Nucleic acid binder design. Sequence first.
RNA 1: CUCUGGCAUGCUAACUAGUUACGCGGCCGGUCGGCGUAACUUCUUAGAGGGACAAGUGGCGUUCAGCCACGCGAGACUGAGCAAUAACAGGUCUGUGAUGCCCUUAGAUGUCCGGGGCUGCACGCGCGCCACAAUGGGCGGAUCAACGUGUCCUGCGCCGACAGGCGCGGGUAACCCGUUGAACCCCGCCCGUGAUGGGGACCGAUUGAAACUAUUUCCCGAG
Lengths: 97, 61, 134, 136, 66, 183, 137
Amino acid sequence: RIRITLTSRNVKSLEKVCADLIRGAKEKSLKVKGPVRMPTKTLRITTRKTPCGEGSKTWDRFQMRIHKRLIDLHSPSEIVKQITSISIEPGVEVEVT
Amino acid sequence: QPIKLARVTKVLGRTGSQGQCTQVRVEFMDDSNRSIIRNVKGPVREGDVLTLLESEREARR
Amino acid sequence: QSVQVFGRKKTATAVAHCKRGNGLIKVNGRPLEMIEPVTLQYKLLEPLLLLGKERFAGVDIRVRVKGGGHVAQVYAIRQAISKALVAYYQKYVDEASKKEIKDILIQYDRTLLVADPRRCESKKFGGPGARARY
Amino acid sequence: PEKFQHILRVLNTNIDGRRKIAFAITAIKGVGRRYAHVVLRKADIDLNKRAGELTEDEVERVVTIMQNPRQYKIPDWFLNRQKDIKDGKYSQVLANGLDNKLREDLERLKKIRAHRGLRHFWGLRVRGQHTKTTGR
Amino acid sequence: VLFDKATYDKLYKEVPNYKLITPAVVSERLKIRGSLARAALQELLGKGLIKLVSKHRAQVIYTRNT
Amino acid sequence: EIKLFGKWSTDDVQINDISLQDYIAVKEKYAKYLPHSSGRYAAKRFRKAQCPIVERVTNSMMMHGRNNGKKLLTVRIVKHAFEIIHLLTGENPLQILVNAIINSGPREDSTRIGRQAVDVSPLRRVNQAIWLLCTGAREAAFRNIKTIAECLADELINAAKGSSNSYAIKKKDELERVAKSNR
Amino acid sequence: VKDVNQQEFVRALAAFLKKSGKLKVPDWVDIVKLAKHKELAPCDENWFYIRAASTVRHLYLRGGVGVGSMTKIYGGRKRNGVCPSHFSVGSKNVARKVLQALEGLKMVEKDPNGGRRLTPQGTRDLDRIAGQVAAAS
RNA sequence: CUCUGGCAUGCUAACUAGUUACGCGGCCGGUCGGCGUAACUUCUUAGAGGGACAAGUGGCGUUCAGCCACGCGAGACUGAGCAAUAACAGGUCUGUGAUGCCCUUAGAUGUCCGGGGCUGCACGCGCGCCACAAUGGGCGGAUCAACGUGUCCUGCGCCGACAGGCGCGGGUAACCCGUUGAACCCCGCCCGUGAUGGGGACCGAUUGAAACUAUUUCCCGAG
């Protein structure tokens, strides 16, 4: 069995390649496990706005979304090589195992 | 002098410098007389009861 | 053949499991009448003395609580044992009594059946808490 | 009642007998809350009594252990005079040497002209405390 | 802090006659320490002259002989 | 089924005052087993008056910074407070508590504008009498062997007949004599 | 160990371990201050039997603890005087000398996971004391 | 508008999240725990899509704009962010291979060596810590969080009283720390017309190459 994870930065492009992967896999009559929704991790960086000591203690709250989706697949690796080459888009990282 | 009791009948508006006073007209319950207005401090609504210690003055603002 | 109704305080989520027995009221294995906040003893016995002793004798509910604090878990227990009981009267019994128990709980305390939407809001800079400003 | 002691003269210092035991001996300098309870725990002395409730035998038994704590199965890290620079002997000064033992070590620093000894002679903070705003 | 027998015999007869028997109120009427007023009052509970109605971590209340 | 606090009830001891009947929650509509509900009473304007008087005193006693956010510490205070006053006075503690609160509400106070004193809102009385009786037991027992629960019972017995010794009673007459000065 | 007063249970279970004087009871650790955040030594003379009963009680509830997490259970608030009071672990040696004492009584087992669940005999003696305290009330 | 939070027993899925059903673990099959892959998702996570608009009633209103009180209801609803025409001589040349000019430019207006620069007769801000034990300190119970971080976080076993030390391990993470056993609080005892058990001022280990002018930490004394 092969477990391919999907770690991305945008949710709109994550669920797109995730749905395009399971559709490209279920059409080959393969046992695909459901998309596991890993908890998202935000990257908080509270930086002072002004590059000096003048201000009213105004801070800048930054964030960065990190979404991970797990996809398992029990099938030979020869049938999954071409499937991994059709759902590749910028913003999402593919980790085949 | 005997003490008289009255029920709040109508709220007029906020009075005072800071607006803490509420001009409210009252009416006696036992004897139907002296439906005079008084000044109240605090949250006042229709239906309250004010134990008027006197029945002589209006004290507007 | 069982209903799992959760009770959510600030963070304490208490899920109660409803079964039928002969006078057994325990939470997290420990008995309900012997929890640490002895001060909040009647709060746990609140759905007992106004709902009916004979109507509460043939019910066995075991609650599992996690999160929140000490007092938040107390109000999460009474939120679980009350809603999970009404859900049993409405799913396995008739609604003639399911509304009878519903009316006696609401006339006494609404938060006994409805969770409070109150949560700890995010802190802002420039002050110690949410609104205060040092 | 009888057998009650109003004052317990221990280490030439008046100790009240109206209060309890483990906290009346604390009136003596050199013995605090920790050392008073340990010397009363080693010896078979009940701490749930008043200071005057004891007899002449228990009061004498207390000072025998306080003067020689190491000889009653008490470790060395519990005393206030551990590893003296002069003699290297662990002891417990009690309101009579504490006024002198904690005095000759300060003079030891002044005779060697140490910065830690100079600030004591000047009367300022010696442990790096910012005396710019405090010490007034 | 136990006073002379004159205070002890009075405690054996008068403080059980009080409506509110408390180590705080008996300390004001007989000048008893906060500890002995609570400690010596436990003996009257063992004799039955008083009844313990509430004994909390920081609250002790006794009632009259009833 | 009388919905007691486990020890005391409010039967045949109803309010003798005919002015604060609405803002004194005693009957079964507001009675509870323990003066601790957390029912969002401080949300609307007059929703705080719906709160039972026993719970408001509990929320009013937790003050002075240190004992803020400690309600369980305060519930046991007023819980033992009702038992001590029931022992000092054979009457019911809820009967004398109503007598203690009706004899402590300021009837007239001076409204500084610019001075004038006419009347006091009935809700302002219970909001202040509860604050007067709670602060009456706080400052009266600070350096005292008498606990806070015992000191609270003294605030009720002296306010029943009007002994003028309670810290709350010494403030009601003060607010009434100064109110007469500016009138 | 539940269904009874957990405070009266450890008060009764400590008396059980006192009668059976088979614990370790070290020579010096039994007369020192318990935790770092503490101010003075425990006022109770048999404090080692009270924590021993409390230690088996927590192992009855949560297993695989080990002496590393036991000190977290008995942690408290340390008084820094002028600095803000914080939380700290209780004591490592006290938990170590109390765990090895129970292993001598065949109540706790050793494992690479660390302080595994109680032995069948350790669980046996706990419920017996739990039944006695229930009958006393 | 955007991200948040409050609910949705309705849906999409979860051995990197769990409950629930009966079986080997002790007690009195009941009653409580630990160990294994059967059903699906209340609890957990995150995707889609709903839900709340002054919509309903009453009252007050150019009977418009709305406002107020009642219901029903997860709320009659809140907390961020982005924020205009512009202005100030209000800060930033010491945030930049942002920069003009000027000064200083090889006895140097880049370093660096142990470092000196942590500095007091009184006035000032903000902030932590109790006092004026009595609602507190203590001691022993008992019992509940959450965001966030982790190549450093830390789990077990030897041993110190504490602070530490040694070997063996997990975790680049919903996988290990971790079920984050948090404090206050809850319960039992002790203390008590007192500068008291109140107040904690001032007088052996660890980090590194190196703490003297205590880096911190702990012990006793210290009040």
